[PDB]
Amino acid sequence: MMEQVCDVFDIYAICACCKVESKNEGKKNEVFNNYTFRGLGNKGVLPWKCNSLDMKYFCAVTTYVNESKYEKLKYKRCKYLKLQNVVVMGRTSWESIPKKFKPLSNRINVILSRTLKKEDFDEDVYIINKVEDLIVLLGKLNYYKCFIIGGSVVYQEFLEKKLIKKIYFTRINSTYECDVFFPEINENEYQIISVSDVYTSNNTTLDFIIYKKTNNDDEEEDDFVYFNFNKEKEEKNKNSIHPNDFQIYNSLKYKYHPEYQYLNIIYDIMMNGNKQSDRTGVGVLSKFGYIMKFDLSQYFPLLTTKKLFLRGIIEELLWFIRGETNGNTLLNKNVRIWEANGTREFLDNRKLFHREVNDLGPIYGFQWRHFGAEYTNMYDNYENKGVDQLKNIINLIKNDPTSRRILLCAWNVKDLDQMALPPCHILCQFYVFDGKLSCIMYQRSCDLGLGVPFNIASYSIFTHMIAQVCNLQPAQFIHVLGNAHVYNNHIDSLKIQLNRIPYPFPTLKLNPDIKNIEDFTISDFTIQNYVHHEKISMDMAA
Amino acid sequence: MMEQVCDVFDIYAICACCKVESKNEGKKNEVFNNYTFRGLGNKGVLPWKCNSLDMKYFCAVTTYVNESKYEKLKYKRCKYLNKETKKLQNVVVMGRTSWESIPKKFKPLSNRINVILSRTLKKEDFDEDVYIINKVEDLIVLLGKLNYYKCFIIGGSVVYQEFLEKKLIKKIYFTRINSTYECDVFFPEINENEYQIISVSDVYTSNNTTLDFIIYKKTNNDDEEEDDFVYFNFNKEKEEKNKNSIHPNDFQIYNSLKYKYHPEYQYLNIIYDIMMNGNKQSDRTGVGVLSKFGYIMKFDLSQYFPLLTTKKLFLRGIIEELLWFIRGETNGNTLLNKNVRIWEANGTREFLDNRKLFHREVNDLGPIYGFQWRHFGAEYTNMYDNYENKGVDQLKNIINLIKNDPTSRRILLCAWNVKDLDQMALPPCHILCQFYVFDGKLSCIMYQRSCDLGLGVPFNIASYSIFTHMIAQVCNLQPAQFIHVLGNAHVYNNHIDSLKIQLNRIPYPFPTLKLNPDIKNIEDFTISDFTIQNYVHHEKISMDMAA
Numbered sequence A: 001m002m003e004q005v006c007d008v009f010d011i012y013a014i015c016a017c018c019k020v021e022s023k024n025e026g027k028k029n030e031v032f033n034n035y036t037f038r039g040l041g042n043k044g045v046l047p048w049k050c051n052s053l054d055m056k057y058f059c060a061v062t063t064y065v066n067e068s069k070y071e072k073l074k075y076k077r078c079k080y081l082k083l084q085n086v087v088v089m090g091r092t093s094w095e096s097i098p099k100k101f102k103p104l105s106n107r108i109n110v111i112l113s114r115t116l117k118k119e120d121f122d123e124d125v126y127i128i129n130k131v132e133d134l135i136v137l138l139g140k141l142n143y144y145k146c147f148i149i150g151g152s153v154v155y156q157e158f159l160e161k162k163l164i165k166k167i168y169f170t171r172i173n174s175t176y177e178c179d180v181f182f183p184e185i186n187e188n189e190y191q192i193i194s195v196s197d198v199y200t201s202n203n204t205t206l207d208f209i210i211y212k213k214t215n216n217d218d219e220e221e222d223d224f225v226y227f228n229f230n231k232e233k234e235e236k237n238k239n240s241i242h243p244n245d246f247q248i249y250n251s252l253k254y255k256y257h258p259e260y261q262y263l264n265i266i267y268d269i270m271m272n273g274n275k276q277s278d279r280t281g282v283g284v285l286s287k288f289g290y291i292m293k294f295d296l297s298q299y300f301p302l303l304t305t306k307k308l309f310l311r312g313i314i315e316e317l318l319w320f321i322r323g324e325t326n327g328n329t330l331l332n333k334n335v336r337i338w339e340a341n342g343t344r345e346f347l348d349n350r351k352l353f354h355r356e357v358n359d360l361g362p363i364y365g366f367q368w369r370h371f372g373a374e375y376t377n378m379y380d381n382y383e384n385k386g387v388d389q390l391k392n393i394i395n396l397i398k399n400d401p402t403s404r405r406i407l408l409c410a411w412n413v414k415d416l417d418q419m420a421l422p423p424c425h426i427l428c429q430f431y432v433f434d435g436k437l438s439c440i441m442y443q444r445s446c447d448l449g450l451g452v453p454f455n456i457a458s459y460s461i462f463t464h465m466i467a468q469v470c471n472l473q474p475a476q477f478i479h480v481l482g483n484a485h486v487y488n489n490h491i492d493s494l495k496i497q498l499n500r501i502p503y504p505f506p507t508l509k510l511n512p513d514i515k516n517i518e519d520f521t522i523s524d525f526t527i528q529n530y531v532h533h534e535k536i537s538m539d540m541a542a
Numbered sequence B: 001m002m003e004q005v006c007d008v009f010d011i012y013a014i015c016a017c018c019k020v021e022s023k024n025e026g027k028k029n030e031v032f033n034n035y036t037f038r039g040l041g042n043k044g045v046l047p048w049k050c051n052s053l054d055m056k057y058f059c060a061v062t063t064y065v066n067e068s069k070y071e072k073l074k075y076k077r078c079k080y081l082n083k084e085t086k087k088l089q090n091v092v093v094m095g096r097t098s099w100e101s102i103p104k105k106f107k108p109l110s111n112r113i114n115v116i117l118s119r120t121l122k123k124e125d126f127d128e129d130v131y132i133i134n135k136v137e138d139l140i141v142l143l144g145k146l147n148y149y150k151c152f153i154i155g156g157s158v159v160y161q162e163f164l165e166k167k168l169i170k171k172i173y174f175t176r177i178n179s180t181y182e183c184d185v186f187f188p189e190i191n192e193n194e195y196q197i198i199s200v201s202d203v204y205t206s207n208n209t210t211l212d213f214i215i216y217k218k219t220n221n222d223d224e225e226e227d228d229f230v231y232f233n234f235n236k237e238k239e240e241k242n243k244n245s246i247h248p249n250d251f252q253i254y255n256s257l258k259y260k261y262h263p264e265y266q267y268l269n270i271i272y273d274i275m276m277n278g279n280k281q282s283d284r285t286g287v288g289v290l291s292k293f294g295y296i297m298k299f300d301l302s303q304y305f306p307l308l309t310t311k312k313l314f315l316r317g318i319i320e321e322l323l324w325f326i327r328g329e330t331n332g333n334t335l336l337n338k339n340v341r342i343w344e345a346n347g348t349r350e351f352l353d354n355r356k357l358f359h360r361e362v363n364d365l366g367p368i369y370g371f372q373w374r375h376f377g378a379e380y381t382n383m384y385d386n387y388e389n390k391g392v393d394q395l396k397n398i399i400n401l402i403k404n405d406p407t408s409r410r411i412l413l414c415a416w417n418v419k420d421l422d423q424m425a426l427p428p429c430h431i432l433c434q435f436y437v438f439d440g441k442l443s444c445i446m447y448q449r450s451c452d453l454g455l456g457v458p459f460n461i462a463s464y465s466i467f468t469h470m471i472a473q474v475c476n477l478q479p480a481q482f483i484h485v486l487g488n489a490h491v492y493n494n495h496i497d498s499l500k501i502q503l504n505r506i507p508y509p510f511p512t513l514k515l516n517p518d519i520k521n522i523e524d525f526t527i528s529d530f531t532i533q534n535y536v537h538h539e540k541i542s543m544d545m546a547a
């Protein structure tokens, strides 16, 4: 009955917007949102000069054509009246391009000039004086899809004009000085339905998202139904958890951003979890056995759907590497991760009656550097006692990289009961190939709301640390979850969190002068270009 | 090249076959093939009497229609007959004898058009809303006159026989009932030039037998969605790592299959993935490998025992091993005296000396798996010592925890004792076991740091599946999942040709494991408390073809 113009002539927008130089109140509590990425141009060029992968994406999207679908499209376009896509740009933009790469290859180029007229453009490029003139020009042409590509105000002229069907939008995750903003996309008009894998090109991370116009072989298909004949017409926590709760999450089609490996596991435990009591007395939803993989060559996987802070987590890791068991070393730096596990009362309830407050016993650090040595107190001298696993793994990686025995184990069975509590991060295995280091960490118990997000960062940083001091490049961090759980108190915060759309991940920089694993200090670590959503108190109370 | 009758009128076969009683004389070793599964009936009824799940599948396939596709099917059938153009149903077609063994309460089959082949009876002999036909040609005539989705031949062996002989079946939906029963009626031997398996289901248990569902195919003797997928796939290049050393036709059958849902494919796909994308690397061994890092398999022990089927495996050895572990033994002589040699090479004078264990007696393997399970932290002396009450008896602790603190996230069994690694004949590959109890059911994750896919993993799966059963039983729970995590996952080069062969065999329904139910303590099990039932498998593959 009714159908809109954009949908009929298949009219699209494709852009790339970087972060924009600013100056703010004082502190860097800089709130991020979608308008964060708006930088289109600087003085006739891209604010970043050159990006080999966005270029490959642009050329891929604006020259891809599917002939065997044209029949349907032609039929559509005529019902009011070699195949190539149409690209459309403003004048500034067309003169920004070298004559080398003009006209744009395999594309019907179409410029908007109120000025110079048709009869001097010597190729087969078209020209039109107004945006309603394009519509008529697509009537007289055989083309697949039409792509607006061109300058601030050409795009601007479509918030009200509503001729765009989808925005193909590259997020370039780095700050450049910019002459031209991009129009503020109205959340009520266009909504994101797809997010890509995160990449590294030309010394920045970037991802590709898709906004869509809001509306406010045949045989073997039955065989699939047949093979699914023994499902349930329901879920499990359909009695607990509702559909409409995950409206933005469920609305997405392509969820390829690596942050979805974490969010999807939350989803899976919420929808399919098993309801259990536990040691705490808050209950959980639990499942058993998952795996995530992060590509550290391309990004640093610091969750972006909430705010995470890493000073504490980095000090803790530095404190593990030194071999320390002294809770006080962390408390004097206002790192309080282990405080509650070092109190008189907590140690008493563990039957550690003869243990000094904050003497956490032969926990991670003592096992990494002194496995099997007899623990006394947090102040004794342990130099050259026990097995220095940490040193042994760095020597294996350097000298026998194809060894299958490169493991770092904290689960010392003899010593569990002397620990303030037994370790969650059971062990680390390493794999080296083609100058690259990959790390698996097995976690026996995984608090998906609070713990896991830090656990990922922690072992990613460590995989970087281990790689730099071994003259290797980081490849994958691989996280295996044993008993994976969402505390009930976290459920509401995590519903909120699943409905947020990830930003491209940050990068981690290490001070490259550090060549020995003992030699890192807090200042040697820098998280760059961390774009993130607002913090979530995971227990929303007090 | 024009249209056959079975394609136009969508004529299919669906059956269930069990295994059939016999006796073997040259070797007790039974040979198995597709024709292993051929029992259809017995004294007028099903050989197994009843099977709820096969029933439920039968009902799903023979009553499922998609209204959206009928318009097109009409056209197809109208265009072939040279003709133009209440809820839609399927046809089922059966022999008279099959009709006569169906109870009246189920007759005619609900929500389906029933058609009965008979010479000796005619429509007057039936009260029921059914079509009678007296030759095969008349079914074609009828199907041309009726409105229907698909047409399923539902048996009689006489009916299956003549319909397969005339090439009138487009696919066979074949249920493999993996048990043996008395039979007098048989399904015809299929012709593998005429019909190829293209899909294999998950494996299930129903009514005290496993079963799966396969599909044979007749051999030839809002939609702006697709485009975004192509965009997001703009940076994945077209070739694979070793594809130029690993050739398409070497996986002809493997890759010809459409749905590979049998749980054995979790193993077979990891092999495939290492062959195609694995890293070429040297190793401790000198043989070199293809390797990758980080995989997970899951097997549902409530539904089957995942003993691989695409090659022959025996378990006496790995069961004796496991019992030896449980007793806490480190004496390799104990196994050799049971003619189990799994630990033999690791125990020689030479091997021990090359590990620098010059003061270790031959076959004294040191503080390995069993010692760590029963005495972690104790000082190892020799294999004859009495270590009673020394070290942490981890095995007893996890049983206690499973019984009395089932929701603990600390039920772990760890063999990687970092202090004792060098005193071991060799360091452990199966590093740890973690347990999980929900709803009277026990799952097990085992993490394996180093995984020989050709040779060890198949035994490793088996081992830890039995141990999940043993532990579950002595804690009064039901076994649920065995979950297997592979770290360094590798294919030895010498094994490739042999795995290329294995990846093109089609799995059989898995067997079942039963344990003596009287054993209520983990230490009281003996070899004869274990039975593998209904193991159907392809032939032995020696992985060294150089042997």
Ligand SMILES: NC(=O)c1ccc[n+]([C@@H]2O[C@H](COP(=O)([O-])OP(=O)(O)OC[C@H]3O[C@@H](n4cnc5c(N)ncnc54)[C@H](OP(=O)(O)O)[C@@H]3O)[C@@H](O)[C@H]2O)c1
Residues within 6 Å of the ligand: A014, A015, A016, A017, A039, A040, A041, A042, A043, A044, A045, A046, A089, A090, A091, A092, A093, A094, A096, A112, A113, A114, A115, A116, A128, A129, A130, A131, A149, A150, A151, A152, A153, A154, A157, A180
């Ligand atoms: N990152 C990205 O996605 C992207 C994409 C394209 C370009 N750029 C960059 O951005 C910069 C250019 O930005 P810009 O906004 O100035 O580019 P532009 O859109 O090429 O320039 C504006 C011009 O387009 C024409 N125009 C605009 N609205 C019109 C209308 N309603 N009817 C007819 N003509 C109309 C006018 O030409 P007349 O003067 O002839 O009237 C106007 O001066 C360059 O540095 C370029 O490299 C970036």
Ligand SMILES: NC(=O)c1ccc[n+]([C@@H]2O[C@H](COP(=O)([O-])OP(=O)(O)OC[C@H]3O[C@@H](n4cnc5c(N)ncnc54)[C@H](OP(=O)(O)O)[C@@H]3O)[C@@H](O)[C@H]2O)c1
Residues within 6 Å of the ligand: B014, B015, B016, B017, B039, B040, B041, B042, B043, B044, B045, B046, B094, B095, B096, B097, B098, B099, B101, B117, B118, B119, B120, B121, B133, B134, B135, B136, B154, B155, B156, B157, B158, B159, B160, B162, B185
């Ligand atoms: N496990 C399974 O998948 C499955 C499926 C179906 C049946 N069954 C079992 O198999 C047994 C029945 O098999 P069966 O071969 O003995 O019987 P059947 O194939 O059901 O019966 C054949 C009878 O149907 C008629 N018939 C067959 N072909 C015909 C043709 N071309 N034209 C006219 N009439 C034709 C004849 O009926 P008249 O004698 O009246 O001429 C013939 O005697 C039973 O035990 C039943 O439970 C098993």
Ligand SMILES: CCc1nc(N)nc(N)c1-c1ccc(OCCCOc2ccc(-c3c(N)nc(N)nc3CC)cc2)cc1
Residues within 6 Å of the ligand: A014, A015, A016, A045, A046, A054, A055, A057, A058, A093, A094, A096, A097, A098, A101, A148, A149, A150, A168, A169, A170
């Ligand atoms: C690849 C950049 C890009 N990415 C995305 N995602 N959307 C866009 N609209 C654009 C884009 C932006 C501006 C634009 O205007 C023309 C001037 C911009 O600067 C360029 C861009 C690309 C090139 C270039 C190049 N260096 N090499 C080749 N082969 N082809 C091209 C033409 C696309 C030269 C100058 C065209 C496309």
Ligand SMILES: CCc1nc(N)nc(N)c1-c1ccc(OCCCOc2ccc(-c3c(N)nc(N)nc3CC)cc2)cc1
Residues within 6 Å of the ligand: B014, B015, B016, B044, B045, B046, B050, B054, B055, B058, B097, B098, B099, B101, B102, B103, B106, B109, B153, B154, B155, B173, B175
């Ligand atoms: C479910 C058995 C089956 N599975 C598969 N996969 N294919 C077949 N062709 C058949 C098959 C169908 C009919 C048939 O007729 C021979 C007579 C004995 O078979 C019966 C009898 C009763 C029932 C039965 C039952 N036991 N309970 C109900 N509710 N409904 C029904 C009829 C569908 C099923 C099979 C034999 C085999």
Ligand SMILES: O=c1ccn([C@H]2C[C@H](O)[C@@H](COP(=O)(O)O)O2)c(=O)[nH]1
Residues within 6 Å of the ligand: A279, A421, A422, A424, A425, A445, A446, A447, A448, A450, A451, A452, A455, B409, B410
């Ligand atoms: O680094 C850590 C440490 C702890 N936990 C969580 C998992 C459990 O919720 C709790 C430890 O309790 P037990 O699993 O030990 O009972 O802490 C983590 O997720 N990450």
Ligand SMILES: O=c1ccn([C@H]2C[C@H](O)[C@@H](COP(=O)(O)O)O2)c(=O)[nH]1
Residues within 6 Å of the ligand: A404, A405, B284, B426, B427, B429, B430, B450, B451, B452, B453, B455, B456, B457, B460
């Ligand atoms: O139960 C076992 C024992 C050994 N291996 C394989 C893994 C490696 O190929 C080899 C051990 O060598 P290292 O990983 O120890 O180098 O044996 C298994 O797969 N399973």
